[PDB]
Amino acid sequence: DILSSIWTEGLLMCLIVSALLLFILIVALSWISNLDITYGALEKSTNPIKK
């Protein structure tokens, strides 16, 4: 007749893939947030031989 629509949804088919979508979004967040900036390239220490 119908699934248990109280403890869990009856129309649950529309939220299973949202989990995968949020999984992809959060993986992208983790991958993006760790991007390097390369401070050392623009900075140096002058020396009579190195510089």
Binding site: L25, I32, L35, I37, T38, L42
Partner: protein, 160 residues
């Protein structure tokens, strides 16, 4: 209630209305700080060029305007008896602009800081970085147009 106009559609409507501001504002603040650190770093070294390198923050500051315009444009159409079709689109519309603004803010925040920090050596690097920063903000622009027709067809196909 009726199947086409239930009572829990306003949940999706409100979330879509209030979600555009959040992520765009977060990205804007992130970029603001991540770039202003560079201005603060360069000012002491160069107290001469302090009103000619504020482009990154200001350009990062338009995504917030974009998220606000989309948000209020969606919001002014807020009411109880709305079709479930009404509530469906709005959440996607809000989240699209929110995360697009976040993405644009990240890139602008890091790139503007890097460019302004490096510009102190060579003068002409300014005009060099202008184009890349403006294109980074144009990336944010590209989300708003899509959101626009999304909102327009949120009602152009009104049925019940």
């Amino acid at each position: 209630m009726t199947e086409l106009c239930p009572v829990y559609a306003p949940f999706f409507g409100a979330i879509g209305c209030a979600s555009a501001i959040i992520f765009t504002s977060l990205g804007a603040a992130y970029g603001t700080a991540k770039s202003g650190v560079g201005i603060c770093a360069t000012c002491v070294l160069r107290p001469d060029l302090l009103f000619k390198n504020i482009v990154p923050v200001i350009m990062a500051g338009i995504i917030a305007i974009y998220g606000l315009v989309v948000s209020v444009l969606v919001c002014y159409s807020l009411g109880q008896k709305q079709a479930l079709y009404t509530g469906f689109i709005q959440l996607g519309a809000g989240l699209s602009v929110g995360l697009s603004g976040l993405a644009a803010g990240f890139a602008i925040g890091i790139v503007g800081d890097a460019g302004v920090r490096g510009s102190s050596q060579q003068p002409r690097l300014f005009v060099g970085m202008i184009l890349i920063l403006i294109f980074a903000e144009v990336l944010g622009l590209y989300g708003l147009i899509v959101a626009l027709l999304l909102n327009s067809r949120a009602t152009q196909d009104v049925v019940c």
